[PDB]
């Protein structure tokens, strides 16, 4: 599957920083920062640099417009929760497509957060809203009266998805070409009767990977310490899964990596 998603952040400064980023799968392609001389939407991927100045003027239009509403929204949220004006507060925006088998919308998103907690989110049916508290019910009532969910349907199943398909063709040589993981296993003792088998996976795109340590063929779901898929810095990602095994029993454990870049799931053995 494929996905486009935007991530907005607005932080209130007493006496507001507005950052927005756009992703196609695990590849960033656009950025807007209010803390710039002449703030503009700028390309972070090669396949959006070929878009015309008309596209970027249009993109910068909504960014500067949304930063204005984020100034109004952060101030409205202050009175909603009756908080003082001396503190900093965060308001995030998460919306985007999820592409399906044929090419149509699989899932649509439109989520708002306030201070790390859920605020209001467009339901999956793209007709109803889920308010997280009585303060968000004010925003909900505001949006049902203006038929905001009608606008999101036309975007998510329309402009959203059509442009996700457009990016995946204009950048098909990178967005649709998967890189296989370069895997290896390390072995470190933690006792005189115990060891740690660590299964590595480096330089793979996309970031979707599942590393599993199986003893005797069966999944050791727990006892398998796993870390966040981290970026390598060049567009690829890394990840490792570890398991603490008794010494002399390491020949019983096998690592299993499945990634879109692999022709078949490969079996590792330190």
């Amino acid at each position: 599957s494929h996905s486009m998603r935007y991530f907005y952040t607005a932080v209130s400064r007493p006496g507001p920083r507005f950052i927005a980023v756009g992703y196609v799968d695990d590849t960033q392609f656009v950025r807007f920062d209010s803390d710039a001389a002449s703030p503009r939407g700028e390309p972070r991927a090669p396949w959006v640099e070929q878009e015309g100045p008309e596209y970027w003027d249009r993109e910068t239009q909504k960014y500067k417009r949304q930063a204005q509403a984020d100034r109004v929204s952060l101030r409205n949220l202050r009175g909603y929760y009756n908080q003082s004006e001396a503190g900093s507060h965060t308001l995030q925006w998460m919306y985007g497509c999820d592409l399906g088998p044929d090419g149509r919308l699989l899932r649509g998103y439109d989520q708002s957060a306030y201070d790390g907690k859920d605020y209001i989110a467009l339901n999956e049916d793209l007709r109803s809203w889920t308010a997280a508290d009585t303060a968000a019910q004010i925003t909900q009532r505001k949006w049902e009266a203006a038929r905001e969910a009608e606008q999101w349907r036309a975007y998510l199943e329309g402009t959203c998805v059509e442009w996700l398909r457009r990016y995946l063709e204009n950048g098909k040589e990178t967005l649709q070409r998967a890189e296989h993981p370069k895997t290896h296993v390390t072995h470190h003792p933690v006792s005189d009767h115990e060891a740690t088998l660590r299964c590595w996976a480096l330089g793979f795109y996309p970031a979707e990977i599942t590393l599993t340590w199986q003893r005797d063929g069966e999944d050791q779901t727990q006892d398998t310490e796993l870390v966040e898929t981290r970026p390598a810095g060049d567009g690829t990602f890394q990840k490792w899964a570890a398991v603490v095994v008794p010494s002399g029993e390491e020949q019983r454990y096998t690592c299993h990596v499945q990634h879109e870049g692999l022709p078949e799931p490969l079996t590792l053995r330190w």
Binding site: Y6, A20, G22, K62, R65, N76, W93, D110, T139, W152
Partner: peptide, 9 residues
Amino acid sequence: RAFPGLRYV
């Protein structure tokens, strides 16, 4: 292509 409308609480 970002959302053309506006989010307002």
